Structure 1
Amino acid sequence: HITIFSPEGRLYQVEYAFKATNQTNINSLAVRGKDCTVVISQKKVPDKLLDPTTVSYIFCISRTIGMVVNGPIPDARNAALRAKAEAAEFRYKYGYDMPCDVLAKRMANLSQIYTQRAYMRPLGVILTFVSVDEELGPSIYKTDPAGYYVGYKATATGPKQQEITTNLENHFKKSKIDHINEESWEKVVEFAITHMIDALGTEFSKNDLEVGVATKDKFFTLSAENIEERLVAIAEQD
């Protein structure tokens, strides 16, 4: 209860905050290419009265940085905005476009500050940033509400975390490298959908999903149509 230390120093509002990130109910996964990066998220559209265009958990922050978030849409659109502008203000104030790993710092920084000074309740969302910067290439860093980020060679956010995970882990103990060997994104994409389908004991149509790709400085969201064609691709080859 409230934002100041427990008897075992663990102020739960931060802890509670987490369940809510998860609670949304969507699964987000991400992996590195070789000259590209990719994230998978599900696109469950219940109400037959909405419009799938307006739905999404992935947005174009920068010309090259995209973001996915397993978390409640209102709080996300916020984080989206601030971040979206921090980079905007950055390029201006410093001469060069802001990289993945950094945004995630002021971002975690920000969520830490809130938390400690009490100027608002933490947002209940986990942000997963992606891109490729010409200093560390395929970059992937994640941030949580307890104001904190780190690095992933490929990650996942969702109700079923460790499952999506373990698969990749096993696929990694064998592929032995710390990323996905392959030149084309289409091909990598195929790979992830693959590793997710296998991971849910579930199948997806051409609208049941949501995916994004980070290239050599030209990040773009995968749309309804192009999305299906990868299912075509990965049907026989399986």
Structure 2
Amino acid sequence: AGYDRHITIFSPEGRLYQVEYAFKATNQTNINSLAVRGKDCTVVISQKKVPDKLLDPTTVSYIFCISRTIGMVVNGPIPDARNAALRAKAEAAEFRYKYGYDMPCDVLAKRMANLSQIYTQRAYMRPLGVILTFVSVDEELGPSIYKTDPAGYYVGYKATATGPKQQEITTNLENHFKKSKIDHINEESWEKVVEFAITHMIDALGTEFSKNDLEVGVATKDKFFTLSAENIEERLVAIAEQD
């Protein structure tokens, strides 16, 4: 009876506690990330925290290059995140082979969401404690942000945020868009979109960042790439000469 809390079957209230507790695990890393769409690019910002001095900072990341055009940032423990990344990469590569064209960001998102739905319905599989944010500049849809969770749910966003202080980032972004009246950052260069992204990250969290406190991924026509400490520093300086 009390096992309706150990495996994924309904509770008398029609709930799935394991999926709920999986959502809880997504915040275990205490990291926040946000993504925004530019005029022709998609940017993703994510806090980077390297506590141990014995760690090689270069190997600590939660952003992944899924395919030449798709990037994915994960909110949740690293092992489940890497499990998700490997699967997504294999899926993206297979799709290209079978259908002759690059897997679209939203399709890969639906596919990963469906796999998640399965862990939600089959008892022997546990949900992954992660939230996946996919980004790219789709050849048909333009800049795109699609996010999936342990419930198998997924949807597209104008912008989005994930993590412990998700709500604050979200309202901040909501406000900016109620003001701008448009669904994207009307900037021609991705560098400025990255700057916007970081600027609002700061405002919302009320914190300052050094070049080693952030992690950035950018998606443009035919390519998704992550920024280096120095590329970021150049970003932080620019925003500094405005405040």
The alignment's TM-score, normalised by the length of structure 1, stands at: 0.98
How far does residue 156 in structure 1 lie from its aligned partner after superposition?
0.5
How far does residue 134 in structure 1 lie from its aligned partner after superposition?
1.4
Q: How does 1:126-141 map to 2 (within 5 A)?
A: 126-141=131-146
**Partner secondary structure for residue 22 of structure 1:** coil
Structure 1 runs of 4+ with >4 Å offset = none
**Partner secondary structure for residue 35 of structure 2:** strand
Contact 2:33–2:47 under 8 Å retained in 1: yes
Mapped pair 1:227 → 2:232: yes
How far does residue 182 in structure 1 lie from its aligned partner after superposition?
0.7
How far does residue 209 in structure 1 lie from its aligned partner after superposition?
0.6
**How far apart are the structure 1 equivalents of 2:33 and 2:18?**
24
Mapped pair 1:211 → 2:216: yes
Aligned to 2:204: 199
How far does residue 237 in structure 1 lie from its aligned partner after superposition?
1.8
Aligned to 1:152: 157
1:71-97 superposed Cα distances (whole Å, 9 cap, x missing partner): 100000000001110010110011111
**Partner secondary structure for residue 138 of structure 1:** strand
Which segments of 5 or more consecutive residues in structure 2 lack a partner in the other structure?
Answer: 1-5
* RMSD over aligned Cα atoms: 0.8
- The percent identity for this pair of structures is 100
How far does residue 114 in structure 1 lie from its aligned partner after superposition?
2.2
**How far apart are the structure 1 equivalents of 2:222 and 2:204?**
30
How far does residue 218 in structure 1 lie from its aligned partner after superposition?
1.1
How far does residue 119 in structure 1 lie from its aligned partner after superposition?
3.2
Which segments of 5 or more consecutive residues in structure 1 lack a partner in the other structure?
Answer: none
How far does residue 226 in structure 1 lie from its aligned partner after superposition?
0.7
**How far apart are the structure 2 equivalents of 1:105 and 1:119?**
22
1:103-123 superposed Cα distances (whole Å, 9 cap, x missing partner): 011100011112212231111
How far does residue 199 in structure 1 lie from its aligned partner after superposition?
1.0
Contact 2:77–2:130 under 8 Å retained in 1: yes
**How far apart are the structure 1 equivalents of 2:145 and 2:238?**
26
**Partner secondary structure for residue 215 of structure 2:** strand
**How far apart are the structure 1 equivalents of 2:113 and 2:125?**
15
